[PDB]
Amino acid sequence: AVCPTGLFSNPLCCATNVLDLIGVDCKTPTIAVDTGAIFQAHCASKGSKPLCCVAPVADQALLCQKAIGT
Amino acid sequence: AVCPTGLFSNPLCCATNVLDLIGVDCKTPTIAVDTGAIFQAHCASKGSKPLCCVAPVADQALLCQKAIGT
Amino acid sequence: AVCPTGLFSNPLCCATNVLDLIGVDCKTPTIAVDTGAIFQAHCASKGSKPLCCVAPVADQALLCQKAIGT
Amino acid sequence: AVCPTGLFSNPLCCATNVLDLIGVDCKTPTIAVDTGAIFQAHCASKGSKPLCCVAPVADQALLCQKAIGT
Amino acid sequence: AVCPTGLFSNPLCCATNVLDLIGVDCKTPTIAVDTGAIFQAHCASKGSKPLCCVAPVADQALLCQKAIGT
Amino acid sequence: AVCPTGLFSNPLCCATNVLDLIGVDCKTPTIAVDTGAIFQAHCASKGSKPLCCVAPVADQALLCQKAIGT
Amino acid sequence: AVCPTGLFSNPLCCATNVLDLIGVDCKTPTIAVDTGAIFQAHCASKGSKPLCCVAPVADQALLCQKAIGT
Amino acid sequence: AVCPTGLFSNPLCCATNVLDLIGVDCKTPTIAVDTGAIFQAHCASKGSKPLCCVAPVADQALLCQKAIGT
């Protein structure tokens, strides 16, 4: 789990987190993201940041929080 | 130049370009970028996008134009 | 042409046009849209409105104007 | 009911739900919607989405929750 | 006329004009307003301001210009 | 008390309540507002609505909720 | 003239200029501001920046541009 | 401490606090601020306000709480 279960449970690669609450330009991982390094690097390659969001869907601003450690 | 002159004449690396207008999460280039390949190459080294923005200052959101050549 | 050439030249089906300038939740037609009726009905079926936008890309808010007649 | 009770207890048809929070371009239901199939059926007849919102008023954006059953 | 012609050529009563640009909480005039005294007189009968806006539709925020004569 | 004690405790006359949370164009009562009618009418005369806000200060958007009954 | 005549002609001391277009928390000079230094220092004392705005009125966000030199 | 602990536990100097929530145009303190008089004294030396914010990072707007003691 790179994201907690529950609310912010859906890991997405997003350009930025506005106000640390709004994940903007989010698109879902293309590989399997089972650790924080995997998640992070997979996003920093896409020119995205690793976020955990309230829905698994991609493009459309939505609530997110950053992945821990990162 | 990798930016026009006149209004949008400052290269900055930004996370995204909201509405294609507003540059968010930008940084001043740290190297000298004089081609479009080098610009987005220096920005990708940040997960950033090459933009052309109304000012040299990177703190506080800005009016930005997507870089040409990228 | 359901959209003018030039700036607002890219026909998209979008949930709404904020301030008559910002097309929100936009996704591109799935069929061929060669008249205003075709364009319109194709969008009203997707629960979208027909807009003409400054880019052919889908999800990400962007500048748009409504299609004429509609 | 097709909405909870408490806070988000008003069915309204809206174009979209910005951030999953803000209902935009909403209308008061014109028919009586007492199942979730009927609700989004009455909304789709507008290109709208069934939402559950903090008030009965449809003019001015609102805090809204996606309908359950839709 | 109590509005110009061209762009801002629709009188509407609105609660305020955000940034002097965005008309918020507007209503269609219910009476015929053909002087500037009568316009803000018909709007004040709502706690509203007389504005001149880009469209006749009052649902959804709008680009508006403060009325002249008021 | 036209406003609850605590958070939304400061009665202001405001042009509108954005998203039912943000009181915009707020200016403080010029008379004494000791009942809901007094509060309300005093605002509807100023072309404002009666709101209860998180601070007694006037011009600057701030969190508010509508006065009860009104 | 610390501000041009015409559009951005009204000198105000404002907390910040959002997107270099929106003067936020603006209040008018308390002394006479006849040069750029006078204007600037008078604002930097109020914890404001010197801006030139489209109206002489204080509190309410409005279009502004920074004073030259500063 | 000049900030609480828990959520809003980072002192930053910011131009304003939009809605009393969003800290805009902030900077990291450059000196050590351990009283409330010293904090707004170090911020006023910038035309800034002492705020207590959810993170140590000052680039990109933030959730902030007005400083207590100021």
Ligand SMILES: CCCCCCCCCCCCOS(=O)(=O)O
């Ligand atoms: C209006 C549509 C924008 C896309 C068209 C191409 C750029 C136009 C630049 C406008 C002038 C400002 O540009 S600048 O060259 O002065 O920096």
Ligand SMILES: CCCCCCCCCCCCOS(=O)(=O)O
């Ligand atoms: C906080 C996460 C939101 C998704 C969880 C499910 C809805 C929670 C409703 C919160 C209370 C308000 O709802 S209501 O039942 O009172 O109308």
Ligand SMILES: CCCCCCCCCCCCOS(=O)(=O)O
């Ligand atoms: C740009 C500054 C605005 C204030 C100046 C006076 C109004 C200018 C109207 C611009 C054209 C649109 O107006 S309209 O007459 O076509 O409706």
Ligand SMILES: CCCCCCCCCCCCOS(=O)(=O)O
């Ligand atoms: C909700 C109203 C806000 C004003 C009341 C006083 C501050 C409340 C802090 C909420 C918890 C977060 O604060 S913190 O101590 O954890 O940083």
